[PDB]
């Protein structure tokens, strides 16, 4: 759980590449996350002392819904530089998704006190319902104490977003993430986090609105399209949820059918959710049509003759 021995995949083609770090950044510009991760995996085996590589690997695996591997990679990067705040931030998020309270709070704590401007706190005594009741209250006191010093740091609001998500207080996380996107309103990742908090808070209409803002910033954000299929499905709008999934699958693949098996792995969990939805819709004819992984029949069924997704690589 503070483990730094990363289980690299052995059949990694980026092991043969002249420069896999630049290759990983290009895979990021193409928003192609599995490939970026393998490219960063290679930079970490080839050069195990290059801190930015471990960080890039951690953030990428996080972005790709592998919190387990993200934590190992980010623990490793932290071991090379304990003063890296993006590392502490990413750990707090992945620890919160994995339901590891103590490590999440330690990470928020480390995220804060690692910054010169907030380090004064930590020399001051702040001690006085949970799996870590004293660490939580201490962490809550410190982040609010810092918001006094700088009420304009959107990442403090994001950190309080993580803190209150950890305690399933979705309304106070939403309130802080709202403030985070009022500052820093360029950041589609924050809008998506606001969306997911509101969804967990059983406010699905407000989640769609924040998801949609994240898609206006980044119209290729497959994760948000999936998240929106989930919220539309929570409001019983199965047709609108189906339309989001067709979009998300078409966009993830860059086309109508899998251009391989790397495509067929990246869409496994959207076809899985699509299958469930088609069950709820009592349309088992279409559950069968899923395994060919041709979105065309689905595009026709759900009324998407208009696939605006041409910005394809």
UniProtKB/TrEMBL annotation:
It is found in: Cytoplasm; Peroxisome. TPR repeats lie at residues 154-187, 188-221. Mg(2+) binds at residue 65. Belongs to the peroxisomal targeting signal receptor family. This is Peroxisome targeting signal 1 receptor PEX5. It comes from Trypanosoma brucei. The chain holds residues 333 to 655 of 655 of the full protein.
